[PDB]
Design goal:
This is part of a larger assembly, with two copies of chain A.
Chain A (H helix, E strand, L loop, with lengths): L2 E6 L4 E7 L14 E5 L10
Antiparallel strand pairs in A: 1-2, 2-3
Organism (chain B): Dictyostelium discoideum (Social amoeba)
Protein name (chain B): Probable polyketide synthase 16
Function (chain B): Probable polyketide synthase.
Chain lengths: 48, 49
């Protein structure tokens, strides 16, 4: 059971943290990876 | 020769807790801790609201 959480942090920004467990039995998750992303439209005029 | 057999998924345990008197509610075991709750103020434990 992998579950991703998305947390609103700032304008555009977001925080991503993951967890795992065993499905039918486990109440215990242990975070495996995390990071931050940002929803900003890029500038495609420096490309190709 | 009695032996004990039983199998209830922990989800059934998390469901049989029913409503919660306090306003914190019951725990949805997931990710960062998550405290859920349903309120119907007509009931006894929330009537004072």
């Amino acid at each position: 059971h992998l579950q991703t959480s998305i947390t609103p942090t700032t304008k555009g920004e977001f925080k991503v943290e993951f967890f795992i467990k065993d499905n039918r039995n486990s109440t215990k998750w242990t975070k495996t990876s995390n990071g931050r992303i940002g929803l900003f439209k890029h500038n495609p005029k420096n490309n190709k | 020769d009695f032996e004990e057999y039983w199998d209830e998924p922990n989800q059934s345990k998390m469901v049989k807790r029913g409503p919660s008197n306090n306003l914190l509610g019951h725990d949805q075991f997931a990710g960062n801790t998550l405290m859920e709750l349903f309120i119907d103020i007509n009931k006894s434990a929330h009537q004072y609201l």
